[PDB]
């Protein structure tokens, strides 16, 4: 075989590149940032109709001001979330304040390359980390198993990512309202999803300065789905 | 937890217009026994610093070895070891202060009181104290042990505050130091007549004087003193 922390001749870590392929197999997750808030949406993708879809937890709270969506080997995300929550609460204990979204993301990304021959392999999951702080306002971050993170105005990850990203390139502008962003996530999710989009196989969430991080009910999302279909038929 | 065995008494020092002076006697006491007489308690580091040490002598010799090793380590991969990147008095002090406080924090102190005297690269006079507790302080005059009680009062009559430093020459300053050493010989029961003195000047550099003796002593009045009160013969 070969070392876990081996470089390829092109100058890339084999295991990191292979974990990126695992993330492409994962279910779609989309995030859009506005001046009124950040929206996070995911494809649930139940493997069978007998599976109770509401138990599929792919959007997750880290703190009141920071939320998180995932894609790939979702079991690997549990210890990443556990670390993120501890990092956020610990910082509040040490400094009597909310922790910056960027600093939280950096702390999570420090776990990424702590593998070798530390854990035995990289994480097989990508994260979208959304939040708000007083300094840099509403933010969206894409955290990879390479240990790298980019800030985004909008970002899609998972199987339908390259198609959804191209759509986000055209649709995003700096004056998007929160409502406009909610519909835009639903619209783009419905396009790339295999099965038909409804309130049971897709989930929305947002983070605002005022109300913090909230996962939407299936009743609330269902109305936004109905509002979306009506608006597309109206021209 | 320690107890000091072979010990050295006072170390005294002061600033003057162009530099600093420091002095200490050559005795190694073993309790009340004045055991060793050839002990050098002033240790030069480079050509710009002198470290004066009182207290336990075994711990003094350990500190000597550390400073000796510090000079060696600083020279490693350092083309400017005898120029811009030479050891400053402030570097040497901060290192010792760090060690002293770390050792007290482990409940195993170096049983010493230390005065680092020197001149910085920009010409500024350096004079700072540190002891077994890790306590540090600076003053125009500094002294340890009995020196703190008897020398400082005499040296402060010459340099009482900062503004008195430019007004104090090396001749006046050395005179005060030598006088203080005489007073300590009169009054400290663990002092010796023989001592060393060091001057670090910003112009003339390091001058190390060995085998000095206390002299011009007043003892003649003793012949007139008879009995302890009523006795006449």
């Amino acid at each position: 075989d070969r070392g876990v922390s081996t470089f390829s001749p092109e100058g890339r870590l084999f295991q990191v590149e292979y974990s990126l392929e695992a993330i492409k197999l994962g279910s779609t997750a989309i995030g859009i940032a506005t001046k009124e808030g950040v929206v996070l949406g995911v494809e649930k993708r139940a493997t069978s109709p007998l599976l109770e879809s509401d138990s599929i937890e792919k959007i997750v709270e880290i703190d009141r001001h920071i939320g998180c969506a995932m894609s790939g080997l979702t079991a690997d995300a549990r210890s990443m979330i556990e670390h993120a929550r501890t990092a956020a609460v610990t910082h509040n204990l040490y400094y009597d304040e909310d922790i910056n979204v960027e600093s939280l993301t950096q702390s999570v990304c420090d776990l990424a390359l702590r593998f070798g021959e530390l854990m035995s392999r990289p994480f097989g999951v990508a994260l979208l980390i959304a939040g708000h702080d007083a300094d840099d306002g509403y933010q969206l971050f894409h955290a990879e198993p390479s240990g790298t993170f980019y800030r985004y105005n909008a970002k899609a990850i998972g199987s339908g990512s390259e198609g959804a990203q191209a759509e986000l390139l055209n649709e995003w502008h700096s004056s998007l309202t929160l409502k406009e962003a909610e519909l835009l996530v639903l619209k783009i999710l419905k396009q790339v999803m295999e099965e038909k989009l409804d309130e049971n196989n897709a989930q929305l969430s947002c983070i605002t300065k005022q109300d913090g991080f909230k996962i939407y009910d299936n009743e609330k999302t269902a109305e936004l789905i109905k509002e979306l279909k009506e608006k597309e038929a109206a021209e | 937890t320690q107890q000091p065995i072979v010990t050295g008494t006072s170390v005294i020092s002061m600033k003057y217009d162009n530099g600093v002076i420091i002095a200490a006697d050559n005795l190694g006491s073993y309790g009340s026994l004045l055991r060793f007489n050839g002990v050098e308690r002033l240790i030069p580091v480079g050509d710009n610093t002198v470290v004066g040490i009182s207290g336990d002598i075994s711990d003094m010799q350990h500190i000597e070895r550390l400073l000796k090793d510090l000079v060696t380590e600083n020279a490693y991969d350092n083309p400017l070891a005898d120029a811009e990147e030479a050891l400053e008095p402030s570097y040497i002090f901060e290192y010792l202060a760090t060690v002293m406080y770390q050792r007290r924090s482990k409940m195993n102190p170096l049983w010493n009181a230390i005065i680092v005297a020197g001149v910085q690269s920009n010409g500024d006079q350096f004079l700072r104290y540190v002891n077994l507790l890790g306590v540090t302080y600076s003053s125009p005059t500094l002294a340890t042990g009995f020196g703190a009680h008897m020398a400082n009062p005499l040296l402060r009559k010459v340099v009482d505050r900062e503004s008195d430093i430019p007004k104090t020459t090396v001749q006046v300053a050395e005179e005060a130091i030598v006088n203080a050493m005489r007073v300590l010989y009169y009054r400290d029961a663990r002092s010796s007549r023989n001592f060393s003195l060091a001057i670090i000047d910003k112009n003339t550099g390091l001058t190390f004087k060995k085998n000095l003796q206390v002299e011009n002593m007043k003892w003649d009045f003793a012949k007139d003193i008879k009995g302890y009160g009523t006795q006449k013969i």
């Binding site: 204990l93 040490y94 400094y95 009597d96 304040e97 910056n100 960027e102 600093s103 300094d135 | 937890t1 320690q2 406080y101 007290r104 924090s105 409940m107 102190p109 104290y129 507790l133 890790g134 306590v135 540090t136 302080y137 600076s138 003053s139 703190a148 009680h149 400082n152 505050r161 900062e162």
Partner: protein, 222 residues
């Protein structure tokens, strides 16, 4: 048996105004009945408009200040040069102190600066990390002399409005920087008279939105 602690004397004093805050401290350093230094500062600018003093055992005091100054430095490195607020500094200092709960730093710590609304702030700590924001605090050897005077003159305690039959209290109001410095100087001259470990010099650090200014005054040297 080796005693790892010592007492270096001295006293410190912090007062907060509307848009400013002062942190004063005498410059005398002592052991037993000897003076070590007539000018050894123990009030320090730590950056981010935070001034700090840790009075008592000077070795522990210097160690703490050194560690906090370093904490400010790493706060910038880890959080994109964000300004460390006075409340966040206070909480951080609690953890520094309580970290040595079973071998304490033998010091009374006071920090001063401006809060996030621009208003003057003073925080005070016990040796093991308990803290509290106050308008007023004296610390150190002469704390017991100065503190009751501050209660009377800063917070107008035991003072009633004349002619109101001791029914209406003297109303609380912010003091000007001029009035506060008068109280600091009088507090230290009084402390110098009656406490042997206090004297030589007074160094005040004033903190406004414009930065950190210094003022020095002579004290009696006996």
């Amino acid at each position: 048996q080796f005693n790892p602690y010592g007492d270096n004397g001295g006293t410190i004093l912090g007062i907060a105004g509307e848009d400013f805050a002062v942190l004063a401290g005498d410059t005398r350093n002592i052991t037993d009945y000897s003076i070590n230094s007539r000018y050894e500062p123990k009030v320090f600018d730590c950056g981010d408009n935070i001034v700090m003093s840790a009075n008592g055992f000077a070795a522990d005091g210097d160690a703490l200040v050194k560690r906090f100054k370093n904490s400010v430095k790493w706060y910038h490195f880890d959080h994109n040069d964000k300004k460390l607020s006075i409340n966040s500094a206070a909480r951080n200092i609690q953890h520094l102190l309580y970290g040595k709960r079973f071998f304490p730093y033998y010091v009374h710590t006071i920090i001063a600066g401006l809060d996030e609304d621009g208003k003057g702030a003073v925080y005070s700590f016990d040796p093991v990390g308990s803290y509290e924001r106050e308008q007023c605090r004296a610390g150190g050897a002469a704390a017991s002399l100065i503190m009751p005077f501050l209660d009377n003159q800063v917070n107008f305690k035991n003072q009633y409005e004349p002619g109101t039959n001791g029914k209406v209290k003297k109303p609380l109001k912010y003091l000007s920087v001029e009035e506060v410095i008068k109280l600091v100087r009088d507090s230290f001259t009084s402390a110098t008279e009656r406490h042997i470990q206090v004297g030589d010099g007074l160094e005040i650090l004033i903190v406004t939105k414009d930065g950190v200014r210094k003022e020095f005054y002579e004290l009696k040297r006996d």
